[PDB]
Amino acid sequence: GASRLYTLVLVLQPQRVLLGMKKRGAGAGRWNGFGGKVQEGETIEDGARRELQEESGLTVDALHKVGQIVFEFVGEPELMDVHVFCTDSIQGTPVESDEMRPCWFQLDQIPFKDMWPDDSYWFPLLLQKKKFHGYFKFQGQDTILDYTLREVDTV
């Protein structure tokens, strides 16, 4: 249907959240959660666990579905269908790699100015343990043309 599955994992603990600064490629220069494309024959949740490991070095125990966000970029045919998960139970220490620099942020110091602009809209919901369905239409990397965002009981 001209949509591609992605995952996004937020390691969200009671007073802090882990974010990674991407060194190059999609989302370079921004703090973001950990995720990527889902593979053939892989469940979305299994893909989320794999991407968390690949990008942050962390092994997640329990993962919970928190949202689904569809991203449209004008002029690009494929919609990004992003399945968002959160966890507080992880193992390992975050690893800085060529591709990603990890840092913990206190919740009142989340660096929204250095994040994708849609984050400002749906992070308030994530932090209050709400679940959501969102859609954001972007022109380029920086401008939200329009959006919808609603809370839901089931993702």
User: What token pair was written down for 17?
Assistant: 């959240």
Site string for ligand BU8, 58-97 (x = CB under 6 A): -------------x--------------------------
Q: Least separation, in Å, of the C-beta of 63 and ligand BU8?
A: 16
* Interface with ligand BU8, residue 7, by CB under 6 A: no
* Interface with ligand BU8, residue 32, by CB under 6 A: yes
* Interface with ligand BU8, residue 34, by CB under 6 A: no
Q: Which is nearer to ligand BU8, 90 or 126 (CB)?
A: 126
| Nearest residue to 128 via CA among 12, 4, 38 | 12
Q: What is the DSSP letter of 88?
A: S
Restricting to residues 100-139, which ones interact with ligand BU8 according to CB under 6 A?
116, 118-119
Among 33, 36, 102, 134, binds ligand BU8 (CB under 6 A): 33
CA distances from 144 to 53, 105, 140, 152 (A): 30, 25, 9, 22
| Amino acid, res. 96 | E
Cα–Cα distance, 45 to 4 (Å, whole number): 15
CA distances from 116 to 56, 80, 112, 113 (A): 19, 14, 7, 8
Residues that bind ligand BU8 (CB under 6 A): 8, 32-33, 71, 116, 118-119
